Structure formats: structure tokens, C-alpha cells
From Swiss-Prot:
Autophosphorylates. Phosphorylated on tyrosine upon binding and activation by EFNA1. These phosphorylated residues are critical for recruitment of VAV2 and VAV3 and PI3-kinase p85 subunit which transduce downstream signaling to activate RAC1 GTPase and cell migration. Induction: Up-regulated by UV irradiation via a TP53-independent, MAPK-dependent mechanism. Homodimer. Interacts with SLA. Interacts (phosphorylated form) with VAV2, VAV3 and PI3-kinase p85 subunit (PIK3R1, PIK3R2 or PIK3R3); critical for the EFNA1-induced activation of RAC1 which stimulates cell migration. Interacts with INPPL1; regulates activated EPHA2 endocytosis and degradation. Interacts (inactivated form) with PTK2/FAK1 and interacts (EFNA1 ligand-activated form) with PTPN11; regulates integrin-mediated adhesion. Interacts with ARHGEF16, DOCK4 and ELMO2; mediates ligand-independent activation of RAC1 which stimulates cell migration. (Microbial infection) Interacts with human herpes virus 8/HHV-8 glycoprotein L/gL and glycoprotein H/gH heterodimer; this interaction triggers EPHA2 phosphorylation and endocytosis, allowing virus entry. It comes from Homo sapiens (Human). It is linked to Cataract 6, multiple types: An opacification of the crystalline lens of the eye that frequently results in visual impairment or blindness. Opacities vary in morphology, are often confined to a portion of the lens, and may be static or progressive. CTRCT6 includes posterior polar and age-related cortical cataracts, among others. Posterior polar cataract is a subcapsular opacity, usually disk-shaped, located at the back of the lens. Age-related cortical cataract is a developmental punctate opacity restricted to the cortex. This is Ephrin type-A receptor 2. Belongs to the protein kinase superfamily. Tyr protein kinase family. Ephrin receptor subfamily. It is found in: Cell membrane; Cell projection, Ruffle membrane; Cell projection, Lamellipodium membrane; Cell junction, Focal adhesion. Receptor tyrosine kinase which binds promiscuously membrane-bound ephrin-A family ligands residing on adjacent cells, leading to contact-dependent bidirectional signaling into neighboring cells. The signaling pathway downstream of the receptor is referred to as forward signaling while the signaling pathway downstream of the ephrin ligand is referred to as reverse signaling. Activated by the ligand ephrin-A1/EFNA1 regulates migration, integrin-mediated adhesion, proliferation and differentiation of cells. Expressed in brain and glioma tissue and glioma cell lines (at protein level). Expressed most highly in tissues that contain a high proportion of epithelial cells, e.g. skin, intestine, lung, and ovary.
Length: 13
């Protein structure tokens, strides 16, 4: 689904 920016930004945070 459209929302991987948050999926990867989540990785760092």
C-alpha cells in the first residue's frame, strides 16, 4: 500500500 516513506522513516526515527 501507499505509505513506505513512513515505513522506512520508521526504521530510523
Amino acid at each position: 500500500l501507499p505509505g513506505h516513506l513512513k515505513r522506512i522513516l520508521y526504521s530510523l526515527l
